[PDB]
Amino acid sequence: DKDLLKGLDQEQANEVIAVLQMHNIEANKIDSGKLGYSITVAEPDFTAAVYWIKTYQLPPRPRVEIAQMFPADSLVSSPRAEKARLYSAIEQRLEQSLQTMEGVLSARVHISYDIDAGENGRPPKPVHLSALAVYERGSPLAHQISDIKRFLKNSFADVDYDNISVVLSERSDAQLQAPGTPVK
Amino acid sequence: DKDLLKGLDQEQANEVIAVLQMHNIEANKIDSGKLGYSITVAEPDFTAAVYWIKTYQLPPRPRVEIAQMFPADSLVSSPRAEKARLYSAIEQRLEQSLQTMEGVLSARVHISYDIDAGENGRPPKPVHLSALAVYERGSPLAHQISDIKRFLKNSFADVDYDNISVVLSERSDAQLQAPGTPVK
Amino acid sequence: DKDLLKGLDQEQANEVIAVLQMHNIEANKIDSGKLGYSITVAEPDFTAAVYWIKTYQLPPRPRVEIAQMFPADSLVSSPRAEKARLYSAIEQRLEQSLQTMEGVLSARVHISYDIDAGENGRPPKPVHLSALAVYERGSPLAHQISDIKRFLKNSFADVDYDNISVVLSERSDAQLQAPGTPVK
Amino acid sequence: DKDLLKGLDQEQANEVIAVLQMHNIEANKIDSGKLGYSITVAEPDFTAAVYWIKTYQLPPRPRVEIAQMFPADSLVSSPRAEKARLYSAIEQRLEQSLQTMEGVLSARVHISYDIDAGENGRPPKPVHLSALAVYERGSPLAHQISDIKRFLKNSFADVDYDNISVVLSERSDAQLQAPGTPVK
Amino acid sequence: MDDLVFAGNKALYLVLILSGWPTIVATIIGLLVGLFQTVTQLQEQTLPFGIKLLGVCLCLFLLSGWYGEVLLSYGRQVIFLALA
Amino acid sequence: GSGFVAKDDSLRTFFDAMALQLKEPVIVSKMAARKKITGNFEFHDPNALLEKLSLQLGLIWYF
Amino acid sequence: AELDSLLGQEKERFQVLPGRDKMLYVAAQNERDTLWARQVLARGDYDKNARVINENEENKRISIWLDTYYPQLAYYRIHFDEPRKPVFWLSRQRNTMSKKELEVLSQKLRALMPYADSVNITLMDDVTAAGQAEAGLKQQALPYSRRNHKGGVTFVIQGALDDVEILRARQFVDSYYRTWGGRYVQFAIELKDDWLKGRSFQYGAEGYIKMSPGHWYFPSPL
Amino acid sequence: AELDSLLGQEKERFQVLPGRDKMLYVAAQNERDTLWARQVLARGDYDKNARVINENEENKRISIWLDTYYPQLAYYRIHFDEPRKPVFWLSRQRNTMSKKELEVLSQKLRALMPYADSVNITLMDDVTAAGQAEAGLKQQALPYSRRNHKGGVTFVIQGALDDVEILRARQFVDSYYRTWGGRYVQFAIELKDDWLKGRSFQYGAEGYIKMSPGHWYFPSP
């Protein structure tokens, strides 16, 4: 067994293993206690496993939110750093409400952030929203695009239906069988 | 057994190996504990390994974000630093959300930076976006430029379809076979 | 075996070797702990190796970025230094994003620094870019000059298609064989 | 065996040797640890080596940059010192990006320094450039002058095609054979 | 208001660095009066104020050419920021 | 042959260039000296070009 | 160990065909199963030779041979539903070879695919290929524009479309390329910013006149 | 240690052809497999002589040889789909060689390629070489401008094209250069910004552009 990644954590190792098992190579997760997890593949599967590490940019970076650049435990709290912290928790709450619909597996929402719209004399502009979704297969996915547009429409001050964009897609094929040990 | 790079990082050595294995030479990744990793090659393919180090500019350097130049732990914070540490989080959150589409393997998003519009008496300029992507092969990659452009259109204040440019391509041929040891 | 360079760096020693092996003389890299590497050549190749040191100006200098002249670790910073650190972080990010296109091995992007616009009542000027690229041979590189121009165009505020200059070129012939020791 | 220089640097000692080998006299480099190097020649080659030291002004001085006259250790910074430290970093990044062209061995760029416009009430003047280059022989060096002008034209705000002057030449004949010891 | 928030930090950073140099030279020799007399004491309280005043005007006679130009530059910079 | 290349002229410096092909001096008023014109022009029939340009620009003339 | 046992537990997604040049062809059905079966032969747990084929990659392979040895040929697609007897959809109203030349073309295509037994050549019609593209583009109620010319047609869809008309145009185009291919009829989904979805009129003295399709579009003040 | 086993595990991507000058030729099909097979022969694990041929670098070598001994020739490509019998696509309406000079050319081209048994010189029409380049360019809805002249044509694509159009132009140019080559018909894509976005203008016979309420621009035709 040739190691290729080590020092990972729990959420990263379950994504590198799930990526490699889709392409007929098997990995082994090893808990090193305090140092972190580790992933080992076989020697015929080592040249192919480095190619999918390079392709999929594994291990995954942590997902960034806008409320991390303006932490709550700072000294100064500017109004730009207060409206940027309010709008980030709104798009984190609308995504968790989008996952509770009937047949939705994942979703991501983006609110149009406004920065200099308040401090000038000019009034702030309208609000623009955008959302992705991954649906379970077997559902007529062309018709559920008019329920996300209805749920997202009057959850804000004033948006139009031309300013909301929903891009959704059915999930991939299920992977249920084992990869297979390399015999020689 | 001649070393050519030592003291490398974990994700740096997995890139130098994945570059050398594409050109029919085999490298060896040796750990050293606190001193980092190290890469050795064989003797008859040392000149080619030096040439492909020089050509591809290996070892890689870490990726640059705009929020590393205006750190959050500073004592003072100008409105240019707050306005650029906020554009630099939507710039790398749309990139994280472009990776969850059907077929995308990697993506990169750039936004135009406007800072001095709110300082003086000029009105603010329009926003310009640009994106790259790498799709899984077997896809109609000409019909996928209107879904990235639709998703990117109303995630900001007011952009047009003439200010978004998507340049995307399919991935390379898969490397699956082993390089092969030099017999002598 | 006479020495000609010592106290070098790991990045510098991999470039002196790649220059010497191109011109049919063989060098040996020798580690010396924390005192760096050293490069020794044979006896009859000493007269030619000093000539290519003088011609190619070896060892290389570290590559200079504009953000190194204005460190963020200072206590108070001028707006002339904050805008100069912002344009130097954009200039490195576009260069690291140009290497991810299909066929680009290396790239370098320059940008106009309009630094005296906010000091007087004159309006700010348009911005200019200039890029270089090294493409893998076997490609008709006349049509690749419009993809880089379209990618760089609406990645900024307002450029024109004649304010961008792209000078790109195919790579050199590969060096895959060993130099060869002189007989005595 | 009479010595003529001692206490030299490594980079100076390789250039004194590369000058004496061009004129058929053989020199020896002696390492003395902390005290530097030493160049010793033979007995009949002393009256000629002392002639070429005076003629070529050896040992060479370290190359001067403009960013050394205004160090960053000053607690206060005038706008003339900041605009000269900015122009002295674009002046080195452009010449490090000219050596990565096809056929260029070395280059040297000069920018016109305009300092008083950003603090007086006078409008700024145009900006002028001037470059030198040394090419590998066998090159069409008349056609290779129209892309250095194209590369340097729009890396600044507004230059004209007659405000750029390029004076380039080809490299000398190669010195490959050994000098020869003085027999008597 | 970037020039407003830059001139306010520059004004207070120039207060800390202009009023810190004669204050530390007022207490280096003030400590070299009290620590020196641990043997053959003869201590009088009003004695080191004369040497501290001579030590203040001594270092002011050195830094008089530098204290002027750090105010001449910030003075020319703060009016150029206001007018143009 | 002949011609005038105007690059953001002001309808007085443009019509004085036509004052040689037209064999008379031209007198342009003050309000008609505010409009601007640019482009390559060629003078081989100036009486028909004055009648066509005074209708595309909106002008009246009298000899 | 046979080849159909070295693959996964579900022995129904891959079909092993014995070749004629003493080889063995594995017939996957998409790009994920192609890399699933190529990793087996790449690590090398099989002593004979074996190749993995497809329906797309075996259709761009024998079109490269065909525009060198049979140029100026009009055809649509090669269908591999039964992989031992493929169907070659040839065009009817654009070729002039006789029955004797079609047997030579059906033999030289049989020699390119050694896993096949006999290639069937069926002459499909040429006006039903565009009728099935226009009736299906009118059924989803999409604003289209037909451009008939010699040797192919072209449907262009422009304008500031919404998300339903983008998902419906992508869903119909990918279901039409799988049947006919992009050799005769091509689709041109592009997003501009005008509230008129492609069409444009000019107003004078009697009403509106419909303009010809050109490159320039008028941007929308709205 | 035979040469077909010193390459990779997949014995399908290469094809070893025996030569006439006692040398083995490995026929790759792109540059990645060319550097994969040239690394084997360069590191020295093969005793006899071997070379790595390619589709392109053999097409640019007998075109260096061709314009010294046979100048003023009109040809398109050399097709290597079956490497033991290449096809030489010659022109028909632009050269007047007889049947004996085409046999001399078919023997002097065979003597340059020691792996080829014979060369199949085929003459081809010159009208369909430009008709296939125009009928494929009208299909992709691209603006163009044909420039016919003596001994080659030239298509010029201008305007402010968007991202769909600059990807449909590149896939057609790349799919046409593979078949015909850049000897007869040349494409030229240049893109520029549009002057009339928010401007009002008059088109037709007397055309002008209004750059301001008080500014006229008369473009020369």
Add this chain to the structure above:
Amino acid sequence: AELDSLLGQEKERFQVLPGRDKMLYVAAQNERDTLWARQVLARGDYDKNARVINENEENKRISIWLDTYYPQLAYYRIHFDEPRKPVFWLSRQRNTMSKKELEVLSQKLRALMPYADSVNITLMDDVTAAGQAEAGLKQQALPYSRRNHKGGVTFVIQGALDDVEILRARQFVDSYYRTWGGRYVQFAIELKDDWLKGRSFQYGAEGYIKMSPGHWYFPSPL
């Protein structure tokens, strides 16, 4: 040790020619491979006498000799596609040499090159040398200006060119100079800005430049 084994592993990128003056010429192909075989012969690991030859250096070496012993000669290039029989391209419409004088020129050029056997002199036409340069310059859509004069033509490519018409002209001039030589026809890629940059002028036979709304200037007739 033989010279064929003293070079690199690839025994095809060089070529050893046994000379006539008891020497051994190595024929390289460019300047990177010239210094690879000049380092071998200069560091001294060979016993007999040897030389490294090129095509550009050997074309510039026996053109100095034709500026002394045969002045006012009209020729183009010396081709070394097979190094034992070079082909000398002489001008047909600008020479006055008979059959005997071409033979004594071949016998005097054979003695300069000891590796050759018989120099073959062929007479190239003169109107085709400028016709292939003009028909190649028109295909790349480049603006130009032809200046015919006695004993050579001149193509002038000036103006403010963009980045694609530089790359499309540098690949044609390098492909034309390699096969025809720079002796007869010469190109001038002079990239410059607009003369009379933002100045309105009145061109043609009585010209002036308007430096200002109230300033005239009367140089050469613009």
